[PDB]
Amino acid sequence: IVEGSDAEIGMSPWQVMLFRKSPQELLCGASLISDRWVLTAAHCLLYPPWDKNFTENDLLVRIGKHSRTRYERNIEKISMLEKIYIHPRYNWRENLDRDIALMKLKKPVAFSDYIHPVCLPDRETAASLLQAGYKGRVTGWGNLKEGQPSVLQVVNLPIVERPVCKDSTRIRITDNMFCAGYKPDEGKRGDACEGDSGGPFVMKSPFNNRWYQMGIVSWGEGCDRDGKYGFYTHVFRLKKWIQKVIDQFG
Amino acid sequence: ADCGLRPLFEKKSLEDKTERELLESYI
Amino acid sequence: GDFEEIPEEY
Ligand SMILES: N=C(N)c1ccc(CNC(=O)[C@@H]2CCCN2C(=O)[C@H](N)C(c2ccccc2)c2ccccc2)cc1
Ligand code: NA
Ligand code: NA
C-alpha cells in the first residue's frame, strides 16, 4: 500500500497473509470469508508468464496478523491448505479477467478479537454501494512505493467511473473488474501495490453496519501513478462461482 | 451470520479512525 | 529474508 497509514489493531480481522514455506516470504494478501474458506486473487496462485504455479503444499495461511515479519505469538493463527480452487475462466493470458481463487483450510480457524470473517455482498448491497465516488478500503503488507511496512497498511479510495477506468489504460477492462483511486485533480492519493495482491477492498454498509468485500486487489500500472487507477476483481459478479464451490465442496 | 462485525469495533460500538470517511461518501 | 521463524510444527 502506498500513501496509506498503519492499520489499527483488529481493524481488518479478515485480513489473511499468504505465506510461502520456502523461502519464507510474503506471497500475497487474502481474506477470511468463513472459518474454513479464504478468498484471494487467482494470479497469486497461477501466473504462467512468470512461471507461477503454486500447490497447496507450497504455502501457509496466516490469520490475525498485524506485524508483517514478526511471528505474532498467541495472536496469529497459521493454517495449512486442504485445496485450491481457481476460477475456470480466469484469463491469465490477457487481462486477468475473473482474477479470483478460493482456498479451503485443512481445519477451521478459531475466531477471536483479531480473526473474524468479512461478508460477501448480496445483489442489493452491491448495487447500492458500487457507485463512482463511494469509497472502499484496501489493506495489505505490499510495497509502500512502486520499501516494505512494519505493520498492516490501510488506505481508503473512491470507486472510479467505468469510462474513466477504461480511458486510463490500454488493457481491455471487463464487467468483472472495477477501478478505484483519486484523480490527479483531487489532491489526495494512495493505491495498492505489489504484495497487496489478493487482499480485500471492503465497504461498510450504511444499512446494517457490516463490512462487505466488494473487490480483490488485482492489477495496476505501476503504483499510485497520477492518472492511473488500481483495478479490483468484482466479487459480486463472480459470486455464483463462489457459492457453487463452497456448496459443492463444503 | 456474524460476518463483517469486528470484535474490537462494531461489537463494542467503537469506530476506527477513518471509517467515517467511507460513510460520508455514501451520499 | 527478514521474516521471523514460524514454529516448526507449521
Ligand atoms: N497499483 C495497483 N493497484 C496494483 C498493481 C499491481 C498489483 C499486482 N498485480 C500484478 O502485478 C498483475 C499480475 C500480472 C502483471 N500484473 C500487472 O498488474 C501488470 N503491471 C499489468 C497487467 C494487467 C493485466 C494483465 C497483465 C498485466 C499491466 C502490465 C503492462 C501494461 C499495463 C498493465 C496489484 C495492485
Ligand atoms: Na483504454
Ligand atoms: Na493514480
Tell me which residue of A82, A55, A60, A33 sits closest to A242, measured CA to CA: A33
CA-to-CA separations, C3 to A41, A64, A197, A219, B20, in angstroms, rounded: 23, 16, 19, 25, 34
Q: In which domain, by residue range, is B6 found?
A: 1-27
The structure's method of determination equals X-ray
A221 CA distance to ligand 3 middle (Å): 9
Domains detected in chain A:
1-12+118-236 (2.40.10.10), 13-117+237-250 (2.40.10.10)
CA-to-CA separations, A193 to A19, A22, A28, B10, in angstroms, rounded: 17, 23, 11, 28
**Is residue A34 among the annotated active site residues?**
no
Hunting for cell 516470504 — which residue is that?
A25
CATH number of the domain bearing residue B25: 4.10.140.10
**Residue A25 β-bridge partners:** A20
**Number of domains making up chain B:** 1
* Residues whose CB is less than 8 angstroms from the CB of residue A186 and which lie 6 or more positions away in sequence, other chains included: none
Element (H, E) at A135: strand A135-140
Rounded CA-CA distance B2/B25 in Å is 25
**Is residue A197 among the annotated active site residues?**
yes
Which of A31, A79, A168, A197 is the catalytic position?
Answer: A197
Give the sign of the dihedral formed by CA A157, CA A162, CA A164, CA A170: positive
List the subunits that have 3+ CB pairs under 8 angstroms with C: A
